[PDB]
């Protein structure tokens, strides 16, 4: 709406640089926080992506789980080379969700269901 855009609001342009600061020290992007175990639709958006794009995600996640075991951050040479908020996942995930809203208004079983634990 009107309280989340950072180039009009002042308190959204300080919430934006607070998450941008905290993502750079582990070298993560905002889309790496999306878990294929939380949402079964995120599992499908990653199977339609090229192999070289998913492999760079698995290597950013391993570099960051190694920095938090050792209790340290990326060195400041590598921290100026980081791009959080450069996305790879949001457009493919909106397409999978749009195809699921069409298969339900028209009848039709879901393509994948969650296992009951």
């Amino acid at each position: 709406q009107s309280f989340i855009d950072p180039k009009k609001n002042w308190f959204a342009a300080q919430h934006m640089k607070a998450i941008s600061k905290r993502l750079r020290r582990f070298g993560l992007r905002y889309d790496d926080l999306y878990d294929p175990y939380y949402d079964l639709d995120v599992k499908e958006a990653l199977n339609r992506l090229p192999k070289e794009v998913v492999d760079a995600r698995h290597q950013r996640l391993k570099r960051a789980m190694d920095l938090s075991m050792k209790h340290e951050y990326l060195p400041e040479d590598l921290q100026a080379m980081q791009t959080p908020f450069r996305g790879y996942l949001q457009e493919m995930l909106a397409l999978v969700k749009r195809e699921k809203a069409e298969r339900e208004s028209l009848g039709g079983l879901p393509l994948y269901q969650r296992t009951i634990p």
Binding site: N47, R48, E99, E102, R103, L106, G108
Partner: protein, 460 residues
Amino acid sequence: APPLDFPLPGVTLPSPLPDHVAPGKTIVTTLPNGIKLASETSAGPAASIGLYVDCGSIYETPLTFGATHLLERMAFKSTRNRTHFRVVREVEAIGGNVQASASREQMGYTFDALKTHVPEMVELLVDCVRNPVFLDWEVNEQLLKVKAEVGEASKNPQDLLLEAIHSAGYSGALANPLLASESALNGLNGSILEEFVAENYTAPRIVLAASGVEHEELLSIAEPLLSDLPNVPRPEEPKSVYTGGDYRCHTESGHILNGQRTHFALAFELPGGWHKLKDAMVLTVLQMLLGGGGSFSAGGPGKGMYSRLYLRVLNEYPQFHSISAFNNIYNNTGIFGIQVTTGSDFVSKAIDITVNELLAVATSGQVDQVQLDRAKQATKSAILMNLESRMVVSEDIGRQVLTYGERKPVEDFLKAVDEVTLKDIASISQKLISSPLTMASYGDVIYVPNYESVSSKFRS
């Protein structure tokens, strides 16, 4: 509701048709960009619409091998306007049937439903051919089924051979394989198919053909959706030459068990195939004259019991299990031959029993005029009975406005089968054996002769 022996009361009944409905004539219309719409009415309640493209398996450069066997599997899928879920649900909503096929010179996409659904049938057919997106997750799940059917093609040894009488025998375009191997399925993706279609599916190569539709209905629907394709020059047609050739493959190492098959075949060539019209109808008569079959099929009177290759081969040589002629006519070239299976211990003389028969019709004298009249009657009826279906009728308007630019009436096909005499059977079959012998084989290959052992038994 009453039982089905008693009529239902309250229903309106249409007034019936007369006993003599006058047949319609084919109407052809050429648009400014070069596309040709062709229509013809009928007396059933159903329509049949098809779309035919000049492209095929001879336009395949070595970067796009296998890219027309895959376009047959990617046919009615996601477009720019409809997903693959909406295409499947729209065809089932009206009770239609949809289908595609690919040749070495022709691609064809068909639809058929009741005549109420003609504006629906047209705009789904044009959108699925004009605007395909090729998404990688849809192409990859179709490639994995082609890869699991090239795992075994060895269960149809009459299209194994018929493809092997085609590579061995030609040099250029007509030697490009239809169903491709394992390595050209590894260089194919959704961007190879995408620019193979944007180059080869152009307005001067597309024909829309309807059967059971009025010509002014087909122009209110299909003309605002096809008129803005660009007018481009057609390309130059790919060339090849008929050389000779031999081919043999001792079969895959598990095939022989206790019994052993032998599948061999011979072939020839004759320069024009359909633009020299007079010569092709002689060879269709010569196909029904030679004929033959597998002979353990038990039908009835009707299909090849009294042919030359029936009562002069299988009726006294019981070691044969199949012998039949085969013609594969194309545009400006053609192939005629004979396919045989026999036993492994009865093989080399089965080449000798085969060849004589091709030498017997080269003689003037060995064929009767009571045998020519039978093959001349069984050919005019096979054309006439086959044209009763609405699907064969629409397929005839498609592949005749791709070869002649017009549909020839069937009266001109029955007129020129009449004129065939006992000496046209001899002359064209003497122009047949003046070309090198194409041979192919499969199964136990060890016991068969070689190329020059057989090719010098004809002329050259």
